[PDB]
C-alpha cells in the first residue's frame, strides 16, 4: 500500500510543497521545489494575540484588482514592531502582499484563521466563526478495534 | 490449621495460559494495526487537501456520499446536490 501511495506523494509535493514537507518531516516548515527535490526551512512560531486583521481586501491604488487573501499585521514579540503581511494556507504568514486577483462580483470567502474561520463579503470582512459552526464530512475510514476480554 | 484440597485437573490453568497467550498477542497486533490505520488517514488527509483544489466536484462527491457540485470558496468549498437525469433523455 505504501509503495503504491508514494506515487501520489511525488505528485503532491509538486502541487503544494509547504504542506507536503510539513506533514512529512514532522515540523511546520516551509519548502520549495529545486528540481526533483525540495529544500526546507523551519518556520518561526507566532502567538495569536500579536496578529490583527486588516479590514478591506480592496486596493485603493489599483481599482478593479484587489487582494485574494486577507491582509494582517503581526509582531514577532509583544513589544515587537508591527509588520504588514497576508494570511496564507493553513495559518502561515506571507511577508509579501502579492496575492492579487481582479475583483469579482459575488465575493464570499472563508479563510482559516486561528482555530476557526473568518468570513469576508465583497472583499470586506464580515465576521469570525468557530470550527464547530461548519459541518464536517470525514475523509477517514472508520475502523473499530476491540480487544479480547480477559 | 487447615488442610488444603487440590483439584485433580490442572487443565484449566493450561487453558488460561493458552487463552492468555493468544489473547495478549492479538491484543498487541490488532492494536498496532489500529494505530497504523490511524496515522494513515491523518497522513492521507494531506493529499486530499490538494485534490479538492484540482476538482472539488469529484472530491466532494466522494467524501459526502452524494453526487454534488462543489466550488472552492477560499479555504473551504461549497456544495450543492445534483438532480438525476434518465439515460434516454
Amino acid at each position: 500500500l505504501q509503495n503504491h501511495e508514494l506515487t501520489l506523494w511525488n505528485e503532491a509535493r509538486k502541487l503544494n510543497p509547504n504542506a507536503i514537507a510539513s506533514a512529512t518531516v514532522g515540523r511546520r516548515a516551509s519548502a520549495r521545489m529545486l528540481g526533483d527535490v525540495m529544500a526546507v526551512s523551519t518556520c518561526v512560531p507566532v502567538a495569536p494575540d500579536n496578529v490583527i486583521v486588516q479590514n478591506s481586501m480592496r486596493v485603493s491604488s489599483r481599482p478593479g484588482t484587489c487582494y485574494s487573501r486577507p491582509l494582517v499585521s503581526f509582531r514577532y514579540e509583544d513589544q515587537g514592531p508591527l509588520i504588514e503581511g497576508q494570511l496564507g494556507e493553513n495559518n502561515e504568514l506571507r511577508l509579501t502582499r502579492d496575492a492579487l486577483e481582479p475583483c469579482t462580483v459575488g465575493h464570499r470567502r472563508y479563510f482559516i484563521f486561528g482555530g476557526g474561520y473568518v468570513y469576508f463579503e465583497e472583499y470586506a470582512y464580515s465576521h469570525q466563526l468557530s470550527r464547530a459552526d461548519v459541518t464536517t464530512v470525514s475523509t477517514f475510514i472508520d475502523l473499530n478495534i476491540t480487544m479480547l476480554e480477559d | 490449621v487447615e488442610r488444603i484440597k487440590t483439584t485433580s485437573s490442572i487443565e484449566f490453568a493450561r487453558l488460561q495460559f493458552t487463552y492468555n497467550h493468544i489473547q495478549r498477542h492479538v491484543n498487541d497486533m490488532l492494536g498496532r494495526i489500529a494505530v497504523a490505520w490511524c496515522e494513515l488517514q491523518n497522513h492521507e488527509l494531506t493529499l486530499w487537501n490538494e485534490a479538492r483544489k484540482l476538482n472539488p466536484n469529484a472530491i466532494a462527491s466522494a467524501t459526502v456520499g452524494r453526487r454534488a457540485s462543489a466550488r472552492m470558496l477560499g479555504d473551504v468549498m461549497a456544495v450543492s446536490t445534483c438532480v438525476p437525469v434518465a439515460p434516454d433523455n
Binding site: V134, T136, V137, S138 | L45, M77, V85
Partner: peptide, 20 residues
C-alpha cells in the same frame, strides 16, 4: 447507468473535512 446535472453551488451550503 444514469446521469447527474446541477448548477454551481452557493455559499449557503458549506462543508469542511475532519481534522486528525
Amino acid at each position: 447507468a444514469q446521469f447527474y446535472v446541477c448548477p454551481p453551488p452557493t455559499g449557503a451550503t458549506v462543508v469542511q473535512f475532519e481534522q486528525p
